[PDB]
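Field: COMPLEX_INPUT
Field: COMPONENT_COUNT = four
Field: RESIDUE_TOTAL = 100
Field: MODE = joint
Values follow.
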Amino acid sequence: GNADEXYKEXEDXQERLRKLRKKLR
Amino acid sequence: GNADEXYKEXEDXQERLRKLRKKLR
Amino acid sequence: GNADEXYKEXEDXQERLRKLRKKLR
Amino acid sequence: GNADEXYKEXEDXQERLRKLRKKLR
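Field: COMPLEX_OUTPUT
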């Protein structure tokens, strides 16, 4: 409903930050 | 300096999302 | 329970990013 | 360049959290 939708959005943000840290370093 | 400090803050936010996902699930 | 807890955590992350953007610019 | 692009990505993530808070509530 919105539990899985949110979870998915959280892990997409975690992964975008992982990526942005690989860009900076 | 500037880069190292930004890198560490991005890691901190990534780690909070990692914890939020566990709290959600 | 966890609806308000999550909401609060989301707005803290939004505010940390606002802050980090004021640091960069 | 480097700064402008990082600034814009931080703004994009901030805007996603802004939207998630509305979806949660």
